[PDB]
């Protein structure tokens, strides 16, 4: 996260770290959506242009974390993966369309003050909240700058950007399964997700029921926090039918 701040304790209790077993290192962010299911970006697991193809046994999920590097004894919980499900129409060839994956845990994780699931949006909440200018929040342990790394989880609030501005910021073909967020050059304030924040949640707090909803997944961006560029996020509601289908069939 570039130009963010340290998270408060328990501020993002659905935040998950995807951790490589060997060598031991941060792979990506992710989010807890139930006691057994974790949501992330497909490109965290499968990206052939960079020879990335992780299987279940390569990774661990670490939940309840605040410190990036410490083993947070008596606070974090570490889970093994039973199975990975990548969207069947994930477009890694072109533009990362449908950049979404689910991971089923081997065993249910116990909820605590530091571990708690985020809500997935319904159509109405998505319609109400996914509007240009409305702000969401992104969290992660990724790079502090485009080209170092944070001691603890970082957070930044960013406004959703109008689709034509998103499109005009890039040569990539944008789809309805993506949205973008960030400040414009004229707006002064800045901030963005970065490498390592991939897969983490873009959340919004509903003013109707005071619950946090995951509207996006950190997906891609041209550099980090560049003027005139924006961060792109997987549109969670647009892919919710797939999410439900996987959970219904395999849960």
């Amino acid at each position: 996260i570039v130009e963010g701040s340290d998270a408060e304790i328990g501020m993002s209790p659905w935040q998950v770290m995807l951790f490589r077993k060997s060598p031991q290192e941060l792979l990506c962010g992710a989010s807890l959506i139930s006691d057994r299911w974790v949501l992330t970006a497909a490109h965290c697991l499968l990206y052939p242009p960079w020879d990335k193809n992780f299987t279940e046994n390569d990774l661990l999920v670490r939940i309840g974390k605040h410190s990036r590097t410490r083993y947070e004894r008596n606070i974090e919980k570490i889970s093994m993966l039973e199975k990975i499900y990548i969207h069947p129409r994930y477009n890694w060839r072109e533009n990362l369309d449908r950049d979404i994956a689910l991971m089923k845990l081997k065993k249910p994780v116990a909820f605590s003050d530091y571990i708690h699931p985020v809500c997935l949006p319904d159509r109405e909440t998505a319609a109400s909240l996914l509007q240009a200018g409305y702000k969401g929040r992104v969290t992660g342990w990724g790079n502090l700058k485009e080209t170092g790394q944070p001691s603890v989880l970082q957070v930044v609030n960013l406004p959703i950007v109008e689709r034509p501005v998103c499109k005009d910021s890039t040569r990539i073909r944008i789809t309805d399964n993506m949205f973008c967020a960030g400040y414009k050059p004229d707006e002064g304030k800045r901030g963005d997700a970065c490498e390592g924040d991939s897969g983490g949640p873009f959340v919004m707090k509903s003013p109707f029921n005071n619950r946090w909803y995951q509207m996006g997944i950190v997906s891609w961006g041209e550099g980090c926090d560049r003027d005139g560029k924006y961060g792109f996020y997987t549109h969670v509601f647009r892919l919710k039918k797939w999410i439900q289908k996987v959970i219904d069939q395999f849960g």
Binding site: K21, Q24, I78, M80
Partner: peptide
């Protein structure tokens, strides 16, 4: 720079 995690979780 990562602290080793308990061996029980590794494979």
């Amino acid at each position: 720079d990562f602290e080793e995690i308990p061996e029980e979780y590794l494979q």
